[model samples]
Target chain A: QIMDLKHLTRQFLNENRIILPKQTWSTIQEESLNIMDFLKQKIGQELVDSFIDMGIINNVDDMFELAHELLPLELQSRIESYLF
Target chain B: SLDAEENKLEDSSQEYNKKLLLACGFQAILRKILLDARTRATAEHIEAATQAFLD
Candidate 1:
């Protein structure tokens, strides 16, 4: 049942980006679940927000800023860097 | 001169996109399962850890 966590993470981040690449949506979830499983181990929580360290936001935009705040800076950079 | 390689790279990118989509759908369901389970189980339980590990 181990699955990828990216899709979940993606969803958690924006809740809308999960629908990229129309045809392969099914298989992608597997990898996403795997990522989530991996993250759970690293962060010691089932949910990322439970331990994401949101204090980094410094009072920016709003929900969007808040979301950005929740993310670890390193991960945010990586995610943006890879976006196609 | 390397147009052929560019085409190949483009093709590979298409394939990568499809595979990535599959991973996305799989994750959506997993998030649901974990969220639901949290309601009934302790967040610190090893079984939860194992389930996430196997997910």
Candidate 2:
């Protein structure tokens, strides 16, 4: 069935294990803030600004660099615990 | 009173259908972009396109 784009995206993220099973943020604002915080702390503000290239991120796979190379191992595990 | 209620229902049905059609259009575009995202463009190319589109 056709659904809202945001709903479809949330399903895609869950299906891919990009987020935890039971844990869900209520709004994009909350999720965006969480993501921004993570990125800003791991990489410098200037670097994060350069990397984002548009405020749009197509998918979680596009985040491979931050997820694999820069984000801490413990944080990675926490994030991964939700991913399939 | 009954006629007024019937007219109200008819008006809302049209509005509801319009919303459904618009949602379908959005979904189709999103699907096309995602499908192309996987096969049509290289990652760098896709990123450039995204940046361009955003700009």
What CA root-mean-square deviation does each model show from the true structure?
16.0, 20.7
Off by more than 4 A, model 1: A1-84, B1-11, B42-55
Tell me the tens digit of each residue's lDDT in model 2 across A1-84.
Answer: 112324544533454234322222333333334433443444331332333453233444443333433234653453344321
Model 1, span B1-55: residue lDDT tens: 1122122222355444333322322233344444444543532322343355453
Best by lDDT: 1
What's the true lDDT of residue B37 in model 1? 44
Question: Candidate 1 at residue B43, lDDT?
Answer: 29
* Per-prediction DockQ: 0.03, 0.03
User: lDDT tens string, model 1, A1-84?
Assistant: 112233224545364232334433444345444554554454341122322232122222232233333344553343234332
**Candidate 2 docking quality: incorrect, acceptable, medium or high:** incorrect
Clashing residue pairs found in predicted model 2 = A17-A83, A17-A84, A20-A82
lDDT of each: 0.35, 0.34
Q: Give me the TM-scores for chain A across all models, comma-separated.
A: 0.30, 0.27
